[PDB]
């Protein structure tokens, strides 16, 4: 009963602490640094195998192999250097929304409107990719999945809740139930100890993987958050939303540090990714294009405009050599 | 300039490409339908006759054409996001329980939202006004009147184009045509030429529903071809 006014007071005091933290703004500090200038990336590769819209892609840790998921029901594992199709995995359910390449490279996860995270073994003795397991337990569509290890996978769902699964047992090791809207994206921290998830409630929550609780919540966005990506050092993360803006939040400072928006940009953001150094924030848009922002200065450093439909997915290699961009035009373009 | 083990990898990729063309043939030949509707709509009976688990798949054939219907059965009471997965689908089969005037405004708001969805702009809606037997029974009994929920029904008259061939009661024709007009009003009000609504009057046990879907999908494909050739 009185707990509502208690929550209001706690929110006000959290805002007061955040304001006390706001002695300056990134923009003020970044003014002195030299501008990234104008970046021009070219499409080195085009991957043409998918029959339908591509909804997700994930780079392998080798920075050469790449898994992409299409609504044709088919994961494709690509050799980025040669454009060779290493694998073509037919999915049981065609309405895939996410796909993840295990850091070991032994497995690929996917899932979607079927509320299942399917783990496929890419390293069978039979020589064919097979379903390792079907993680069931989410009551909504699977929106994002990321391996933390060949046995541990964290998934986000339309059930407004994330879940860490033990793949061997097929059970949710822990569940994260702080969100009030569909969770669209999750990003693991570099050390894998924490992960951030953005939901349709316009908030991004930082989660402790071990403890299973939300450490911090961030609420700058005015609309659904579709994409979330940690900064390279793990002390900050960027969120892309339907608000047509991206936002860089800092964990330590526990608030928004910068907003990346432009008047000419009115479409929502579908994907976000940092460069290796974190100086470039690459964000895909519903405008069949992608914007490369100066993460420190908030200027639009460049554009990747080689897609005939919405840019669904975006990913920078671990070594930072290239950036892949999948699209509803059924193609994936590697940019350098 | 490729090693022996690269040439073989390229050959494997070529074999995958051949399999992908084989799959593309099927993907193109198959028409994908999104079955939407409220819990009372009766969509479950429709799919049964046509013949966690987040999405249910039904397969059927009409005139050697393959239809894959998808009923998103286990999701939250919110579609803003997952509905985006269903663009280009050959059609949205939207089922509405006509006999329930209490929820008719809710069904109209749902149809609006679907029709005005920015990602469903080019997707046509086959509108199944299901449970017509119940609507006729309710209208003839007289216990409940549509007017109570839709005052415009008091000042609405059947158009001269109405075709009650089976010989239904005039009151039932007026009611069902008012409901169909209520949905077609939203349909026309906004998006025109980019997507059409195909209203149908169907009962729970109707054997013609698959034929209705096939005809409306044929017209949708014809409209796509016409637009491709700038004929519409």
């Amino acid at each position, epitope marked *: 009963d009185q707990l509502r006014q208690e929550a209001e007071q706690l929110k006000n005091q959290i805002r007061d602490a955040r304001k006390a933290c706001a002695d300056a703004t990134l923009s003020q500090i970044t003014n002195n640094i030299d501008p990234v200038g104008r970046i021009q990336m070219r499409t080195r590769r085009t991957l043409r195998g998918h029959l339908a819209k591509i909804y997700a892609m994930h780079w392998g840790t080798d920075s050469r192999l790449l898994v992409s998921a299409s609504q044709d029901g088919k994961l494709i594992i690509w050799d980025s250097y040669t454009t060779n199709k290493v694998h073509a995995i037919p999915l049981r359910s065609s309405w895939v929304m996410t796909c993840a390449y295990a850091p070991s490279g032994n497995y690929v996860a996917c899932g979607g409107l079927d509320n299942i995270c399917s783990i496929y073994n890419l390293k069978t*003795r039979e*020589g064919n990719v097979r379903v390792s397991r079907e993680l069931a337990g989410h009551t909504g569509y699977l929106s994002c999945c990321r391996f933390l290890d060949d046995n541990q996978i964290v998934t986000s769902s339309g059930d407004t809740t994330c879940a860490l699964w033990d793949i061997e047992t097929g059970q949710q090791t822990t569940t994260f139930t702080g969100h009030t809207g569909d969770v669209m994206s999750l990003s693991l921290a570099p050390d894998t100890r924490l992960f951030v998830s953005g939901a349709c409630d316009a908030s991004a929550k930082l989660w402790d993987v071990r403890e299973g609780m939300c450490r911090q919540t961030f609420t700058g966005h005015e609309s659904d958050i579709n994409a979330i990506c940690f900064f390279p050092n793990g002390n900050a993360f960027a969120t892309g939303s339907d608000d047509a803006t991206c936002r860089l939040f800092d964990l330590r400072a526990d608030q928004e540090l910068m907003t990346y928006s432009h008047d000419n940009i009115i479409c929502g953001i579908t994907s976000v990714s940092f460069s290796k150094s974190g100086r470039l924030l690459l964000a895909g848009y519903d405008d069949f294009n992608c914007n490369v922002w100066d993460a420190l200065k908030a200027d639009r450093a460049g554009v990747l405009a080689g897609h005939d439909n919405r840019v669904s997915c975006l990913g920078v290699t671990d070594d930072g050599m290239a950036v892949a961009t999948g699209s509803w035009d059924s193609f994936l373009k590697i940019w350098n | 300039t490729l*090693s022996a*083990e690269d*040439k073989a990898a390229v*050959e494997r990729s070529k*074999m995958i490409e051949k399999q992908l063309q084989k799959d593309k043939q099927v993907y193109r030949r198959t028409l994908r339908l999104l079955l939407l509707g409220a819990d009372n709509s009766g969509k479950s009976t429709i799919v049964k006759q046509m013949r966690t688990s987040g999405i249910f798949e039904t397969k059927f054939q009409v005139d050697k054409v393959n239809f894959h219907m998808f009923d998103v059965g286990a999701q939250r009471d919110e579609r803003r996001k997952w509905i985006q997965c269903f663009n280009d689908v050959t059609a949205i089969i939207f089922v509405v329980d006509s006999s329930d005037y209490n929820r008719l405004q809710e069904a109209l708001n749902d149809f609006k939202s679907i029709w005005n969805n920015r990602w469903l702009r080019t997707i046509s809606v086959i509108l199944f006004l299901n449970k017509q037997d119940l609507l006729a029974e309710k209208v003839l009994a007289g216990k409940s009147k549509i007017e109570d929920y839709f005052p415009e029904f008091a000042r609405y008259t059947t158009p001269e184009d109405a075709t009650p061939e089976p010989g239904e009661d005039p009151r039932v024709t007026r009611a069902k045509y008012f409901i169909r007009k209520e949905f077609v009003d939203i349909s026309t009000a906004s998006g025109d030429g980019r997507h059409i609504c195909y209203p149908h009057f169907t009962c729970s046990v109707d054997t013609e529903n698959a034929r209705r879907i096939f005809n409306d999908c044929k017209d949708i494909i014809l409209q796509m071809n016409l637009r491709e050739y700038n004929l519409v």
Partner: single-chain antibody
């Protein structure tokens, strides 16, 4: 994974014989296949290759025109038809699976083999010592040299190390001069400078006793080494 060779036996010179290889326990269709013959008390020598699918068939010059390699995927059976057999064709013929894609390990499984008794641009593989007595627990090194560098422009060095224990079919140990094959203890390590390569067994055991063969996969004649024996 099972590759069972059949056929073979005693054949009069100049005759014909159809060796067969039944494959079970793996996706035979997706694997390229090789026939590799081992003459009695002699080293391994590659015979024939048929890629996944049926394209890219290759033969050793010693059998071109006489041997024809085929496969029936529905029955999962590889075939080697021999037309005019010679005394030099007496050997144990091994069925080898090899799947080629980035990061793959070809030649990873060999069948038990079938005995068949008959009544200059190739890369030469040289092994320094045909025999090297050694004791368990000691770190022993086996050497290989290639007349042509096996380092390709793509960064891969196509050197394969196989171990054939007595009375057993060869087993893949290393497949790109450094990559340990699945199921092979870490005892075995591979290294090379682009034209000379070394296989090190750090803690040799009784199960490591056998003949170690080197193979090049740069060019498809797939020349093996003479084989370095290990005895205790």
């Amino acid at each position: 994974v099972q590759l069972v060779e059949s056929g073979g036996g005693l054949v009069q010179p100049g005759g014909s014989r159809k060796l067969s290889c039944s494959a079970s326990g793996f996706a035979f269709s997706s694997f390229g296949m090789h026939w590799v013959r081992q003459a009695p008390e002699k080293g391994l020598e590659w015979v024939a290759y048929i890629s996944s699918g049926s394209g890219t068939i290759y033969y050793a010059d010693t059998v071109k025109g006489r041997f024809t390699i085929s496969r029936d995927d529905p029955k999962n059976t590889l075939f080697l038809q021999m037309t005019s057999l010679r005394s030099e064709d007496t050997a144990m013929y091994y069925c080898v699976r090899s799947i080629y894609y980035y990061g793959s390990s070809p030649f990873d499984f060999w069948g038990q083999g079938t005995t068949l008794t008959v009544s200059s641009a190739d890369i030469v593989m040289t092994q320094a010592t045909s025999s090297v007595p050694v004791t368990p627990g000691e770190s022993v090194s086996i050497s290989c040299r290639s007349s042509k560098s096996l380092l390709h422009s793509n960064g891969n060095t196509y050197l394969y190390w196989f171990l054939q224990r007595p009375g057993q079919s060869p087993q893949l140990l290393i497949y790109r001069m450094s990559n340990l094959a699945s199921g092979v203890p870490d005892r075995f390590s591979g290294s090379g400078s682009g034209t000379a390569f070394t296989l090190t067994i750090s803690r040799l055991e009784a199960e490591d006793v056998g003949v170690y063969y080197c193979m090049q996969h740069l060019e498809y004649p797939l020349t093996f080494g003479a084989g370095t024996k290990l005895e205790l």
